[PDB]
Symmetry: D3
């Protein structure tokens, strides 16, 4: 069997979001990014000529990005943010006592500690594997999944999982 690595990258695999980094002793001002996701896979070329169909890969990456797109990225497990539910809003109080308030529908609650490129990358990798389906990947002989998330065309973070 011949091993091949597949890469799917497009300006279409994007989520335009607001966020700010906060950790112990540090907080930055509210801003945003055009985030971009590329997916890399390793496996054997199957009897149909594909390792796995690009169209399937393109479809699932678009779906994960869409869920994030056009929202403030709110880290659920942050140890430095006080996240309060006030009416139909999320109220965020920081260590330096600075206060934010956004409508809940404007926010996407993500099970992460920091809205860093590294942690958003891990979240997307976990979501993509469930979206494409793990046993479906194994039927296509895929044994390696890798996502690259860019905060900007200059700053990229890459995470992987051996499956």
């Amino acid at each position: 069997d011949q091993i091949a690595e597949l890469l799917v990258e497009s300006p279409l695999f994007s989520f335009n979001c607001a966020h700010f980094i906060a950790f112990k002793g540090f907080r930055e001002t509210l801003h945003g990014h055009n985030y971009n996701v590329s997916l890399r896979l390793r496996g054997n070329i199957q009897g149909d000529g594909y390792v796995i169909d690009f169209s399937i890969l393109k479809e699932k990456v678009r779906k994960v990005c869409k869920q994030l797109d056009h929202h403030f990225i709110l880290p659920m497990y942050s140890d430095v943010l006080n996240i309060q539910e006030v009416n139909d809003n999320f109220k965020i109080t920081c260590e330096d006592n600075s206060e934010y308030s956004f409508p809940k529908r404007d926010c996407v609650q993500i099970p992460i500690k920091h809205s860093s490129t590294e942690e958003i990358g891990l979240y997307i990798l976990n979501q993509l594997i469930e979206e494409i389906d793990l046993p479906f990947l194994k039927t296509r002989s895929v044994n390696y999944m890798e996502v690259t998330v860019s905060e900007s065309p200059s700053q990229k973070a890459t995470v992987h999982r051996n499956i």
Copy 2:
């Protein structure tokens, strides 16, 4: 005299910002972009071989972008936003009664009606001409200034002024 057109474009000429479009009957959720600015000018090639030194152009575009960078873009002259000053915060109330609250230092107050690519473009064009200095441009025989602002690698707006 020989006419030449100069273009300065770089991922460095960027401002990573949060915003949302609001006008009559329409409001979108809070998100963000990696905005990018390119500058185009027309003039005669001077006795020093330049129309105008690229280093000067690169310096001033960076300065204008820096002022916007890492902030929520707040349109001062919006007819559909209620902008209240509450302590050290800006409180924004929309037509649909949705409420936002950001620290003042997280916001950049821009004399525009909408945080659209078109209007941000006009603002930057006006700021760049004052930053480079109008009579300084005329000594270099520059008679045309043009800025292109991109909200994303896919969406661009271009404005100009004949000087």
Copy 3:
């Protein structure tokens, strides 16, 4: 009123097609390209902050490209091609007596003389104006439409219409 130029460009605005150039005294072999379309327009910034919404522009360009995508581009008005209908196929006979046969559903019949980048550009410009709707463009104060079609990242053709 402030004049602004809008540009929409994406690898998404693509049609992957087969074709060959044929004119008097010249014929090339069957091949293909990843064609790409960018749209440029000029108008005044309206009271909503837009010249025209990017989402509308992105939607219509995708629709025009989709109609062409994944087909052999067949020039209807070619003076050097003999196009015969044989069962459910198009049979193409060239000046040098070379013969092609494709299923009809594999072909897209385009009202052009040559499948050149220039002529495909004109066709798309005409189709896009009808797709976006001419009187709709005039309500947005758009007076200039321009399409750029690339045969390759290296070879581009640009056509326009004053509206």
Copy 4:
């Protein structure tokens, strides 16, 4: 000895071709792509300062691409295509009884089962190693060869060989 990885990538390393994917239970319509090839090598930096001269790498990749360029990619070992020689043409009959006919000179017969990016990649890798010459690579201490073939700027396949 210091290990270095060399990459050669250019829009020049291209073959503009027609093709369609066909396997068991699936057939797509005739279309085309601007295919692009990049080559990656690993080895030790030699006494002349190079692992291997870029000019040699650039020359051989161009030669392999040229052989494919401007043709319909015809898979020789397809289990779902009936390839008939009719006069100076190749007649291709599919499982769904759809019929194609191209002049032989318009086709490039490649020892593959499917004209997929994965299989075209493997073919090019095999051809490039023979073109650069295997024992010539070993004299330059090259122990790893890797080709990346893109069907589009969005879809890439990568294969390698340890030498």
Copy 5:
């Protein structure tokens, strides 16, 4: 007749050169650039489907770039450089009394005052028109020629001629 604008741009249209800017009161240190040339032309679409064949445009731009490629760019008409012929070398003495010496074959003597992007652009425009041939351009109904030279991906100069 339908007007179309043709653009040819490639990393292939390059000349990798050494140079330094010198004018009255200013001199910079010796360095180099990967210069890149793109050509833009306007004309009517001819009866063969082309305004002008891209292959002809690609061939002539490559020829002009090749003449410059791999040399020190020496401005012949500089008012601040003392250019002496010493044996098989060019000896260059600057205003600040700094001395350079290169073999003559390493230098390309260009009829310009400064090795600026603007002036190199003008030279290439003049050379390209003569290389493609002026009356040949008029037979193809070309009435506009435009070259863009980039010193870097960030700094570009564009010049034109109405023909």
Copy 6:
């Protein structure tokens, strides 16, 4: 602990330099390039959400590039170049008896044998590790450093060190 790979790449991480390759039996003419450096790191995501802050990486790469920028790259340990100190100049005599002379301030003396992309890459990797500081990288759990240097957008060399 979760392993993440960080990539920092920008047209800003550049050094525009003059050079020529010389080794046994071969010498090329003086020319130049827009060199570009990208940095790749592997480590665990720390309690602050970062493997290592991008801003620190961006700052140090800029500093190393700046030291090289706007100079002739002079290889100190070349076995085929006779490097003489004449007044305030470096005089370079080659095997074929060709002579160069540059002011010392125009040259950057680099502890390498050839000004190849491979060897410049190794030098930068060594300089970057000392600039970021080795024990500082170990506190951030970084165990892999990798630099990619491009002579042109087409030609790249990549070197690494396991730390």
